[PDB]
Amino acid sequence: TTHYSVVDKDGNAVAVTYTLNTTFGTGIVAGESGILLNNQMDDFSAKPGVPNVYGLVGGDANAVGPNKRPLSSMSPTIVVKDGKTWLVTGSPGGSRIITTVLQMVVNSIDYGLNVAEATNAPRFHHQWLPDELRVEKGFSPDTLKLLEAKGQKVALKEAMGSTQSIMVGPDGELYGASDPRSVDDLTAGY
């Protein structure tokens, strides 16, 4: 999965998140087309109560069915401030997309972090099942100690996401940031 954002000179904005699901999808090219095929079907609930590759579960609502679109977690998002497009963001991450984008929004609104600061900040995540508070490296040992005291089951795991965001200044100027978690990416303009 990958996400990208765009804002033009007139102020129009677009946020796109698209994917093959897992990296390279099935890894199957369609004949001589040179096109890789997705493995999006794993996003359906194969059986009620049994988790898919991202630990997500379902029932009747997200059951496999003909011509049905499997439930996604993709969240291209736009935040509006004072009636104007302010933050354009999104990210890959399967079940973690929801919490990653959420943190971008909270970091921007509640903590007043500029787009780069919000992007480089560490992330945490809890998806109900499994019952664990997943964290990235970067949180204070003092803070993690307090969380464990509160009853959270902290699990240090792999870095989450790849936000590619743009913030629109009050005067219309643009500010952008690419995720430190992904190399060879780029935010550029003119």
Binding site: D8, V16, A30, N38, R69, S75, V106, N114, D184, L186
Partner: protein
């Protein structure tokens, strides 16, 4: 000066993506006079070539568009399960799900929507013809580009598990028995031909033309389900965005078939009841509150979310501030509640 992290700055237009080449393609389109949608489609096609890991023509996704005038809309180009798909298609003879079937077999694929989605957006909200936004990608496929650290690393890690197991895939991404290395040139002649035909015949090339034929045959010969009828019946869908209000800021995101918009708004609704700014980033209190709020949202996700064209999603109740308030009142900032004690919420009183 007090900032440790600085954003990239621009005065007119800007593009942010996972790949430098694709980002530059988008910026060039903007410099050429294309609008945000034109550039977004160009980037999408460019990534389909330079970022085979996720950029694609064989997958699907979502697009959020907001015009300078405030008009906000969502484009759903999520893959559709084939007409031959069945509820228990991924269960083994014992009735247990087989992850191999849903992730690495030909049965794991849904009918692709990317080409349909980009064309729906370009035709209605763009200003340039498809051939012009596909050209950059076409050249990259035909003439090739240098494999960087990101692509080399992904080919070696994730690619090794699947690409070499299929002849056509191996012929493109493997070389001398190993994954392409950093510094190697990746030329994708077959993809270039597909891109060339799409640029000249339009999206129908993918859903009804030669490409469609190639997909259908790949499936038919290997036990897959996608047929020409499936491809011909695919349609991207413009839907109303899911949105909410958080402390005076309006948040717009994707509606079902995505669970993203609904749960981001639901969680923000819950958080609005706490003084997050006071706790501050990286504080145990802030993290505790959010972790707890997230549990309820994911519990609701497992029961109420699905394709809106097949099931009725109670999005109003899920994004109702009173409902969020009832969840907020359950959160103990000093004691986490085990997931075993959390079930999908009772929405009746909120709908």
């Amino acid at each position: 000066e007090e900032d440790v992290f600085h954003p990239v700055r621009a005065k007119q237009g800007m593009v942010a993506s996972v790949d430098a080449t694709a980002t530059q393609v988008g910026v060039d389109i903007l410099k050429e006079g294309g609008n945000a949608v034109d550039a977004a489609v160009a980037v999408g096609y460019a990534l389909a070539v330079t970022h085979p890991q996720a950029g694609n023509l064989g997958g699907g996704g979502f697009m959020l568009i907001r015009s300078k005038n405030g008009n906000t809309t969502a484009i759903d180009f999520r893959e559709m399960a084939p007409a031959k798909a069945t509820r228990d298609m991924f269960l083994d003879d014992q009735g247990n799900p087989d992850s191999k079937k849903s992730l690495t077999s030909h049965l794991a694929s849904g009918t692709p929507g990317t080409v349909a989605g980009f064309s729906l957006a370009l035709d209605k909200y763009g200003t340039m013809p498809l051939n012009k936004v596909v050209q950059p990608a076409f050249k990259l496929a035909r003439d090739g580009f240098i494999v960087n650290d990101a692509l080399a690393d992904d080919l070696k890690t994730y690619g090794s598990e699947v690409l070499p197991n299929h002849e056509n895939s191996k012929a493109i991404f493997w070389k001398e028995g190993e994954p392409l290395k950093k510094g190697d040139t990746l030329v994708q002649a077959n993809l270039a031909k597909s891109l060339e035909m799409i640029a000249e015949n339009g999206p129908d090339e993918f859903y009804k033309g030669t490409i469609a034929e190639q997909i259908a045959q790949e499936m038919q010969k290997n036990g897959g389900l996608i047929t020409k009828e499936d491809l011909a019946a695919y349609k991207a869908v413009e839907r109303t965005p899911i949105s909410g209000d958080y402390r005076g800021y309006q948040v717009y995101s994707m509606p079902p078939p995505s669970s993203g918009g609904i749960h981001i708004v639901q969680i923000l609704n819950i958080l609005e009841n706490f003084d997050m700014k006071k706790y501050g980033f990286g504080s145990a209190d802030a993290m505790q509150i959010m972790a707890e709020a997230e549990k309820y949202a994911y519990a609701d996700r497992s029961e109420y979310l699905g394709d809106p064209d097949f099931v009725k999603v109670p999005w109003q109740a899920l994004t109702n501030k009173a409902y969020a308030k009832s969840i907020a009142d359950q959160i103990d900032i000093n004691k986490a509640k085990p997931s075993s004690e959390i079930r999908p919420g009772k929405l009746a009183p909120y709908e």
